[PDB]
Protein backbone atom coordinates (compact mmCIF):
# COMPACT_ATOMS: atom_id res chain seq x y z
CA UNK A 1 0.00 0.00 0.00
CA UNK A 2 1.51 3.26 -0.94
CA UNK A 3 -1.07 5.11 2.10
CA UNK A 4 -1.73 3.83 5.28
CA UNK A 5 -4.09 4.32 7.92
CA UNK A 6 -3.74 3.66 12.10
CA UNK A 7 -5.45 2.33 13.43
CA UNK A 8 -8.05 0.44 11.37
CA UNK A 9 -10.81 0.34 14.12
CA UNK A 10 -11.16 2.21 17.44
CA UNK A 11 -13.83 2.70 20.45
CA UNK A 12 -13.41 5.37 22.96
CA UNK A 13 -15.49 7.42 25.46
CA UNK A 14 -16.12 11.07 24.77
CA UNK A 15 -13.86 13.41 26.27
CA UNK A 16 -10.52 11.68 25.18
CA UNK A 17 -8.26 13.17 22.85
CA UNK A 18 -7.71 10.44 19.83
CA UNK A 19 -5.44 10.63 17.11
CA UNK A 20 -5.28 8.73 13.68
CA UNK A 21 -2.31 8.48 11.48
CA UNK A 22 -1.73 8.68 7.45
CA UNK A 23 1.56 7.78 6.16
CA UNK A 24 2.74 7.58 2.03
CA UNK A 25 5.38 6.17 0.31
CA UNK A 26 5.50 8.57 -2.89
CA UNK A 27 5.92 11.80 -0.77
CA UNK A 28 3.10 13.15 -2.86
CA UNK A 29 2.69 17.08 -1.64
CA UNK A 30 -1.09 16.91 -1.19
CA UNK A 31 -2.41 15.08 1.72
CA UNK A 32 -6.28 15.04 3.05
CA UNK A 33 -8.53 13.29 5.67
CA UNK A 34 -11.91 13.13 5.01
CA UNK A 35 -14.76 11.64 7.11
CA UNK A 36 -17.63 9.57 5.28
CA UNK A 37 -21.37 9.86 6.98
CA UNK A 38 -24.42 7.83 5.95
CA UNK A 39 -25.99 10.44 3.42
CA UNK A 40 -23.50 12.84 2.87
CA UNK A 41 -20.60 10.87 1.17
CA UNK A 42 -16.96 12.32 2.16
CA UNK A 43 -16.61 15.66 3.60
CA UNK A 44 -13.37 17.27 3.63
CA UNK A 45 -12.09 17.81 7.45
CA UNK A 46 -8.60 19.19 6.62
CA UNK A 47 -5.92 18.99 3.77
CA UNK A 48 -2.19 20.48 4.02
CA UNK A 49 0.80 21.19 0.66
CA UNK A 50 3.28 20.67 2.26
CA UNK A 51 5.26 20.59 5.98
CA UNK A 52 3.54 22.93 8.32
CA UNK A 53 0.92 24.24 5.28
CA UNK A 54 -2.78 23.35 6.68
CA UNK A 55 -5.70 24.66 5.10
CA UNK A 56 -9.43 23.86 6.88
CA UNK A 57 -12.14 21.85 5.44
CA UNK A 58 -16.00 22.31 5.44
CA UNK A 59 -16.15 20.50 8.38
CA UNK A 60 -12.70 21.35 10.80
CA UNK A 61 -14.48 21.98 14.27
CA UNK A 62 -13.40 19.44 16.89
CA UNK A 63 -10.47 18.26 15.20
CA UNK A 64 -7.13 19.74 14.73
CA UNK A 65 -3.75 18.09 12.28
CA UNK A 66 -0.45 18.22 11.63
CA UNK A 67 1.96 17.70 8.99
CA UNK A 68 4.98 15.98 10.75
CA UNK A 69 6.84 14.74 7.36
CA UNK A 70 6.22 14.92 3.87
CA UNK A 71 5.31 11.16 4.77
CA UNK A 72 2.57 11.85 7.18
CA UNK A 73 0.02 13.52 7.81
CA UNK A 74 -1.72 13.20 12.08
CA UNK A 75 -5.38 13.82 12.10
CA UNK A 76 -6.73 14.45 16.05
CA UNK A 77 -10.42 14.96 17.80
CA UNK A 78 -9.42 17.31 20.13
CA UNK A 79 -12.05 15.88 23.17
CA UNK A 80 -14.02 13.45 21.11
CA UNK A 81 -18.34 13.44 20.58
CA UNK A 82 -20.53 10.94 20.10
CA UNK A 83 -20.95 13.10 16.61
CA UNK A 84 -17.54 11.95 15.37
CA UNK A 85 -18.32 8.37 15.10
CA UNK A 86 -17.33 7.79 11.41
CA UNK A 87 -15.39 6.10 8.83
CA UNK A 88 -12.08 8.53 8.46
CA UNK A 89 -10.11 8.24 5.55
CA UNK A 90 -6.93 9.77 3.98
CA UNK A 91 -6.08 10.43 0.73
CA UNK A 92 -2.66 12.00 -1.16
CA UNK A 93 -3.17 13.52 -4.59
CA UNK A 94 -0.35 14.25 -7.49
CA UNK A 95 -0.41 17.52 -9.11
CA UNK A 96 -3.24 16.24 -11.44
CA UNK A 97 -5.68 14.72 -9.00
CA UNK A 98 -4.63 10.82 -9.36
CA UNK A 99 -5.96 10.21 -5.80
CA UNK A 100 -4.63 7.51 -3.69
CA UNK A 101 -7.33 6.50 -0.80
CA UNK A 102 -6.28 4.90 2.61
CA UNK A 103 -8.48 2.06 3.33
CA UNK A 104 -10.16 3.63 6.21
CA UNK A 105 -10.58 4.41 10.02
CA UNK A 106 -13.82 3.01 11.87
CA UNK A 107 -13.95 5.16 14.86
CA UNK A 108 -17.12 5.04 17.21
CA UNK A 109 -17.58 7.36 20.12
CA UNK A 110 -19.31 6.01 23.01
CA UNK A 111 -20.41 8.55 26.15
CA UNK A 112 -20.46 5.43 28.47
CA UNK A 113 -18.09 2.47 28.24
CA UNK A 114 -20.40 0.75 30.73
CA UNK A 115 -22.86 0.04 28.24
CA UNK A 116 -20.47 -1.78 26.08
CA UNK A 117 -21.53 -5.29 25.22
CA UNK A 118 -20.99 -8.45 22.68
CA UNK A 119 -23.42 -9.86 20.95
CA UNK A 120 -25.35 -13.30 21.95
CA UNK A 121 -25.20 -15.29 18.46
CA UNK A 122 -28.03 -17.94 17.70
CA UNK A 123 -28.26 -20.09 14.54
CA UNK A 124 -31.98 -20.80 13.28
CA UNK A 125 -32.22 -24.39 11.44
CA UNK A 126 -34.03 -24.33 8.27
CA UNK A 127 -37.88 -25.05 8.27
CA UNK A 128 -39.11 -28.89 6.96
CA UNK A 129 -41.83 -27.31 5.40
CA UNK A 130 -39.43 -24.89 3.20
CA UNK A 131 -37.29 -28.18 2.33
CA UNK A 132 -40.76 -29.61 1.22
CA UNK A 133 -42.14 -26.46 -0.89
CA UNK A 134 -38.89 -25.44 -2.73
CA UNK A 135 -36.18 -27.65 -2.07
CA UNK A 136 -34.15 -25.07 -0.61
CA UNK A 137 -33.34 -24.60 3.50
CA UNK A 138 -32.16 -21.02 4.73
CA UNK A 139 -30.28 -21.22 7.64
CA UNK A 140 -30.42 -17.64 9.88
CA UNK A 141 -28.20 -16.34 12.20
CA UNK A 142 -29.27 -13.56 14.79
CA UNK A 143 -26.80 -11.32 17.05
CA UNK A 144 -28.38 -9.61 19.93
CA UNK A 145 -27.67 -7.67 22.38
CA UNK A 146 -24.30 -5.77 21.44
CA UNK A 147 -23.70 -1.92 21.89
CA UNK A 148 -22.07 -0.52 20.14
CA UNK A 149 -23.57 -0.79 16.35
CA UNK A 150 -19.75 -1.86 15.69
CA UNK A 151 -19.11 -5.68 14.18
CA UNK A 152 -18.97 -7.64 11.26
CA UNK A 153 -21.04 -10.90 10.00
CA UNK A 154 -19.65 -13.87 7.99
CA UNK A 155 -20.43 -17.42 7.83
CA UNK A 156 -18.38 -20.22 7.59
CA UNK A 157 -19.32 -23.86 5.94
CA UNK A 158 -16.77 -26.67 6.69
CA UNK A 159 -14.44 -24.45 8.06
CA UNK A 160 -14.40 -22.22 5.05
CA UNK A 161 -15.61 -18.46 4.12
CA UNK A 162 -18.98 -18.44 2.27
CA UNK A 163 -20.45 -15.23 0.04
CA UNK A 164 -22.52 -17.11 -2.15
CA UNK A 165 -26.30 -17.58 -0.66
CA UNK A 166 -25.66 -14.91 2.26
CA UNK A 167 -27.91 -11.86 2.74
CA UNK A 168 -27.11 -9.91 5.54
CA UNK A 169 -28.59 -6.64 6.88
CA UNK A 170 -26.59 -3.91 5.59
CA UNK A 171 -27.24 -1.92 9.47
CA UNK A 172 -28.43 -3.36 12.67
CA UNK A 173 -31.97 -2.41 14.31
CA UNK A 174 -32.37 -0.80 18.02
CA UNK A 175 -33.54 -2.98 20.41
CA UNK A 176 -35.15 -0.13 22.24
CA UNK A 177 -35.21 2.66 19.29
CA UNK A 178 -36.38 5.34 22.13
CA UNK A 179 -32.88 4.89 24.05
CA UNK A 180 -29.60 6.92 22.81
CA UNK A 181 -27.62 3.73 23.93
CA UNK A 182 -29.79 1.43 22.95
CA UNK A 183 -28.44 -2.55 22.16
CA UNK A 184 -28.65 -3.74 18.65
CA UNK A 185 -29.48 -6.57 17.06
CA UNK A 186 -28.55 -7.69 13.50
CA UNK A 187 -29.67 -11.31 11.10
CA UNK A 188 -28.16 -12.56 8.33
CA UNK A 189 -29.39 -15.61 6.09
CA UNK A 190 -27.19 -18.47 4.34
CA UNK A 191 -29.58 -20.41 1.95
CA UNK A 192 -28.14 -24.02 0.61
CA UNK A 193 -30.06 -26.84 -1.50
CA UNK A 194 -32.09 -28.67 0.88
CA UNK A 195 -29.47 -31.67 0.06
CA UNK A 196 -26.88 -30.01 1.31
CA UNK A 197 -28.60 -29.13 4.76
CA UNK A 198 -29.90 -32.75 4.58
CA UNK A 199 -25.94 -34.15 4.84
CA UNK A 200 -25.37 -34.43 8.46
CA UNK A 201 -21.52 -33.78 7.54
CA UNK A 202 -22.32 -30.79 6.72
CA UNK A 203 -21.15 -27.65 9.31
CA UNK A 204 -22.61 -24.49 9.07
CA UNK A 205 -21.05 -21.50 11.75
CA UNK A 206 -21.99 -17.58 11.69
CA UNK A 207 -19.21 -15.53 13.02
CA UNK A 208 -19.48 -12.15 14.35
CA UNK A 209 -16.34 -10.30 15.04
CA UNK A 210 -17.21 -7.76 17.72
CA UNK A 211 -15.45 -4.74 18.13
CA UNK A 212 -14.93 -3.39 21.98
CA UNK A 213 -12.92 -2.77 24.97
CA UNK A 214 -9.05 -2.90 25.06
CA UNK A 215 -7.15 -4.72 27.45
CA UNK A 216 -5.65 -0.95 28.58
CA UNK A 217 -9.68 -0.11 29.87
CA UNK A 218 -10.77 0.09 33.46
CA UNK A 219 -13.52 -2.77 34.00
CA UNK A 220 -15.57 -2.00 37.30
CA UNK A 221 -18.79 -4.72 36.73
CA UNK A 222 -19.04 -8.48 37.90
CA UNK A 223 -19.96 -8.94 34.02
CA UNK A 224 -17.36 -10.30 31.57
CA UNK A 225 -15.38 -7.35 30.26
CA UNK A 226 -16.94 -6.68 26.74
CA UNK A 227 -13.81 -7.00 25.25
CA UNK A 228 -13.15 -6.96 21.11
CA UNK A 229 -13.89 -10.94 20.49
CA UNK A 230 -15.62 -13.41 18.10
CA UNK A 231 -18.82 -15.05 19.44
CA UNK A 232 -20.14 -17.69 17.15
CA UNK A 233 -22.99 -20.30 16.21
CA UNK A 234 -22.95 -23.45 14.49
CA UNK A 235 -25.61 -26.03 13.32
CA UNK A 236 -25.02 -29.39 11.56
CA UNK A 237 -26.26 -30.82 8.78
CA UNK A 238 -29.58 -33.00 9.56
CA UNK A 239 -31.80 -35.95 7.63
CA UNK A 240 -35.30 -36.42 7.01
CA UNK B 1 -19.63 28.48 -5.78
CA UNK B 2 -18.68 24.96 -6.71
CA UNK B 3 -20.86 22.47 -5.87
CA UNK B 4 -21.79 18.32 -7.27
CA UNK B 5 -25.45 17.24 -7.02
CA UNK B 6 -26.74 13.68 -6.88
CA UNK B 7 -30.64 13.17 -6.02
CA UNK B 8 -31.82 10.55 -4.58
CA UNK B 9 -30.28 8.90 -1.93
CA UNK B 10 -31.41 5.00 -2.80
CA UNK B 11 -32.22 3.87 -6.08
CA UNK B 12 -33.54 1.00 -7.72
CA UNK B 13 -32.80 -0.55 -11.07
CA UNK B 14 -34.73 -4.32 -12.74
CA UNK B 15 -32.10 -6.44 -13.20
CA UNK B 16 -30.95 -6.67 -17.04
CA UNK B 17 -31.96 -3.21 -17.29
CA UNK B 18 -30.04 -0.07 -18.38
CA UNK B 19 -28.47 1.47 -15.04
CA UNK B 20 -28.44 5.39 -14.91
CA UNK B 21 -27.02 7.16 -12.11
CA UNK B 22 -27.04 11.36 -12.37
CA UNK B 23 -25.02 14.02 -11.67
CA UNK B 24 -24.57 17.31 -11.56
CA UNK B 25 -21.90 20.22 -11.05
CA UNK B 26 -22.68 24.03 -10.44
CA UNK B 27 -18.76 24.90 -11.75
CA UNK B 28 -18.56 28.23 -13.70
CA UNK B 29 -15.27 26.78 -15.62
CA UNK B 30 -16.10 23.30 -16.65
CA UNK B 31 -14.26 20.89 -13.52
CA UNK B 32 -12.79 17.65 -13.45
CA UNK B 33 -15.62 15.22 -12.79
CA UNK B 34 -15.06 11.64 -11.07
CA UNK B 35 -17.28 8.53 -10.37
CA UNK B 36 -16.11 6.45 -7.57
CA UNK B 37 -17.78 3.19 -6.23
CA UNK B 38 -17.99 1.27 -2.70
CA UNK B 39 -18.93 -1.82 -1.63
CA UNK B 40 -19.96 -3.25 1.80
CA UNK B 41 -16.74 -2.44 4.26
CA UNK B 42 -14.91 -1.54 1.74
CA UNK B 43 -13.02 1.63 0.24
CA UNK B 44 -13.58 3.85 -2.70
CA UNK B 45 -12.55 2.73 -5.86
CA UNK B 46 -12.48 4.86 -9.41
CA UNK B 47 -14.63 4.04 -12.37
CA UNK B 48 -14.26 6.86 -14.50
CA UNK B 49 -12.99 10.45 -14.90
CA UNK B 50 -13.88 13.47 -16.72
CA UNK B 51 -10.22 15.26 -17.22
CA UNK B 52 -10.87 17.31 -20.62
CA UNK B 53 -9.60 15.09 -22.98
CA UNK B 54 -12.52 12.79 -24.72
CA UNK B 55 -16.23 14.25 -23.29
CA UNK B 56 -17.80 10.45 -24.17
CA UNK B 57 -15.31 8.50 -21.17
CA UNK B 58 -15.27 4.99 -20.55
CA UNK B 59 -14.21 3.14 -17.43
CA UNK B 60 -14.19 -0.51 -16.44
CA UNK B 61 -17.07 -2.94 -16.80
CA UNK B 62 -18.54 -1.61 -19.27
CA UNK B 63 -19.29 1.78 -17.52
CA UNK B 64 -19.41 4.83 -19.23
CA UNK B 65 -20.33 8.35 -18.80
CA UNK B 66 -20.58 11.50 -20.98
CA UNK B 67 -19.80 15.31 -19.88
CA UNK B 68 -22.56 17.60 -21.41
CA UNK B 69 -21.60 20.99 -20.59
CA UNK B 70 -24.40 22.56 -21.95
CA UNK B 71 -27.15 20.69 -19.06
CA UNK B 72 -24.09 20.65 -16.65
CA UNK B 73 -24.52 16.85 -16.53
CA UNK B 74 -22.25 14.09 -16.16
CA UNK B 75 -24.51 11.10 -15.11
CA UNK B 76 -22.94 7.21 -14.80
CA UNK B 77 -24.61 4.35 -17.20
CA UNK B 78 -23.98 0.97 -18.08
CA UNK B 79 -25.54 -1.12 -20.22
CA UNK B 80 -27.44 -3.74 -18.21
CA UNK B 81 -27.85 -4.15 -14.20
CA UNK B 82 -26.54 -7.04 -12.94
CA UNK B 83 -26.73 -8.21 -9.19
CA UNK B 84 -23.00 -6.96 -9.02
CA UNK B 85 -23.68 -3.90 -8.97
CA UNK B 86 -25.17 -3.25 -5.99
CA UNK B 87 -23.15 -0.58 -4.01
CA UNK B 88 -23.25 2.97 -3.45
CA UNK B 89 -21.58 5.32 -6.37
CA UNK B 90 -20.27 8.89 -5.45
CA UNK B 91 -19.99 11.81 -8.19
CA UNK B 92 -16.63 13.97 -7.61
CA UNK B 93 -15.89 17.19 -8.94
CA UNK B 94 -12.00 19.20 -8.75
CA UNK B 95 -12.51 22.52 -6.52
CA UNK B 96 -10.63 25.61 -5.81
CA UNK B 97 -7.25 23.97 -8.02
CA UNK B 98 -6.78 21.94 -4.60
CA UNK B 99 -8.93 19.12 -3.77
CA UNK B 100 -11.57 17.07 -5.18
CA UNK B 101 -15.19 17.24 -3.48
CA UNK B 102 -17.65 14.55 -2.92
CA UNK B 103 -21.74 14.41 -3.35
CA UNK B 104 -23.47 12.88 -1.04
CA UNK B 105 -23.80 9.28 -2.69
CA UNK B 106 -26.20 6.94 -4.25
CA UNK B 107 -26.76 3.64 -3.34
CA UNK B 108 -27.84 0.90 -6.25
CA UNK B 109 -30.20 -2.04 -5.54
CA UNK B 110 -31.25 -4.00 -8.46
CA UNK B 111 -33.94 -5.99 -8.20
CA UNK B 112 -34.23 -9.86 -8.83
CA UNK B 113 -36.18 -10.87 -12.06
CA UNK B 114 -38.70 -13.28 -10.06
CA UNK B 115 -39.99 -15.37 -12.71
CA UNK B 116 -41.76 -17.70 -10.26
CA UNK B 117 -42.17 -16.12 -6.91
CA UNK B 118 -43.29 -18.46 -4.33
CA UNK B 119 -44.25 -16.64 -1.60
CA UNK B 120 -43.92 -18.03 2.10
CA UNK B 121 -43.78 -17.29 5.46
CA UNK B 122 -41.61 -20.18 7.78
CA UNK B 123 -41.18 -20.59 11.41
CA UNK B 124 -37.18 -21.53 12.05
CA UNK B 125 -36.06 -23.02 15.53
CA UNK B 126 -32.86 -22.40 17.40
CA UNK B 127 -30.64 -24.76 16.70
CA UNK B 128 -29.89 -25.15 20.49
CA UNK B 129 -32.82 -26.05 23.35
CA UNK B 130 -35.14 -23.31 22.80
CA UNK B 131 -38.34 -22.05 22.92
CA UNK B 132 -36.93 -19.59 21.07
CA UNK B 133 -37.52 -19.27 17.16
CA UNK B 134 -37.62 -16.72 13.98
CA UNK B 135 -40.17 -16.35 11.06
CA UNK B 136 -38.50 -15.93 7.55
CA UNK B 137 -40.85 -14.34 4.77
CA UNK B 138 -39.52 -15.50 1.60
CA UNK B 139 -39.45 -16.01 -2.45
CA UNK B 140 -41.92 -12.79 -3.04
CA UNK B 141 -40.82 -10.95 -6.32
CA UNK B 142 -40.13 -7.50 -6.68
CA UNK B 143 -43.88 -5.75 -6.02
CA UNK B 144 -43.41 -6.84 -2.04
CA UNK B 145 -42.29 -4.75 -0.16
CA UNK B 146 -41.99 -5.17 4.01
CA UNK B 147 -43.16 -2.85 6.37
CA UNK B 148 -42.04 -1.71 9.87
CA UNK B 149 -43.71 -3.55 12.80
CA UNK B 150 -46.46 -2.10 14.46
CA UNK B 151 -45.58 -3.74 17.79
CA UNK B 152 -42.44 -2.45 19.78
CA UNK B 153 -41.63 -6.12 20.82
CA UNK B 154 -41.68 -7.53 17.30
CA UNK B 155 -38.37 -7.37 15.47
CA UNK B 156 -38.92 -7.29 11.45
CA UNK B 157 -35.70 -6.40 9.26
CA UNK B 158 -35.57 -4.38 5.95
CA UNK B 159 -35.85 -6.81 2.77
CA UNK B 160 -32.11 -8.37 1.35
CA UNK B 161 -31.60 -10.52 -1.92
CA UNK B 162 -29.51 -13.36 -1.43
CA UNK B 163 -27.82 -14.42 -4.71
CA UNK B 164 -27.23 -18.43 -4.66
CA UNK B 165 -24.51 -19.16 -7.33
CA UNK B 166 -24.91 -22.84 -6.76
CA UNK B 167 -28.33 -22.85 -8.44
CA UNK B 168 -27.95 -19.13 -9.88
CA UNK B 169 -31.10 -18.29 -7.66
CA UNK B 170 -31.81 -15.34 -6.15
CA UNK B 171 -34.47 -14.39 -3.82
CA UNK B 172 -36.00 -12.02 -1.54
CA UNK B 173 -36.43 -12.03 2.30
CA UNK B 174 -37.51 -10.70 5.38
CA UNK B 175 -36.98 -11.91 8.94
CA UNK B 176 -39.14 -11.20 12.21
CA UNK B 177 -38.71 -12.35 16.13
CA UNK B 178 -40.50 -11.32 19.20
CA UNK B 179 -39.55 -12.33 22.72
CA UNK B 180 -43.39 -12.59 23.49
CA UNK B 181 -45.73 -15.54 24.26
CA UNK B 182 -48.16 -14.68 21.91
CA UNK B 183 -46.13 -14.35 18.73
CA UNK B 184 -47.09 -16.26 15.69
CA UNK B 185 -45.40 -16.14 12.09
CA UNK B 186 -49.08 -16.06 11.33
CA UNK B 187 -49.19 -12.95 12.60
CA UNK B 188 -45.70 -11.01 11.78
CA UNK B 189 -45.97 -9.24 8.87
CA UNK B 190 -49.15 -8.24 9.62
CA UNK B 191 -48.42 -4.44 8.85
CA UNK B 192 -47.29 -5.54 5.41
CA UNK B 193 -49.41 -5.83 2.09
CA UNK B 194 -47.82 -9.42 1.28
CA UNK B 195 -49.47 -11.50 -1.87
CA UNK B 196 -52.78 -12.74 -1.97
CA UNK B 197 -51.04 -16.25 -2.35
CA UNK B 198 -48.58 -16.49 0.48
CA UNK B 199 -47.93 -20.09 1.73
CA UNK B 200 -48.19 -20.59 5.48
CA UNK B 201 -47.61 -24.16 6.60
CA UNK B 202 -49.12 -25.68 9.74
Known amino acids: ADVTQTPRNRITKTGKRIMLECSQT?????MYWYRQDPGLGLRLIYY???????NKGEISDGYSVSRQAQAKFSLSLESAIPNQTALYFC??????????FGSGTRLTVVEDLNKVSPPEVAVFEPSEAEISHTQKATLVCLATGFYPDHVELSWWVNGKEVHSGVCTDPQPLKEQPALNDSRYSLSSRLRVSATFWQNPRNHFRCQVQFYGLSENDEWTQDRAKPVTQIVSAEAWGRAD | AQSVTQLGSHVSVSEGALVLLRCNYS??????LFWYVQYPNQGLQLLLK??????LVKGINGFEAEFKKSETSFHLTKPSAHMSDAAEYFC??????????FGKGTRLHILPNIQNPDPAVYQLRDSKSSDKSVCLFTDFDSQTNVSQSKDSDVYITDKCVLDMRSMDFKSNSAVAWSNKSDFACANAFNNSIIPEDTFFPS
Open chain 1, 91 to 100: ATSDESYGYT
Open chain 1, 26 to 30: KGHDR
Open chain 2, 27 to 32: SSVPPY
Open chain 2, 92 to 101: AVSEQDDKII
Open chain 1, 48 to 54: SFDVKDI
Open chain 2, 50 to 55: YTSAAT
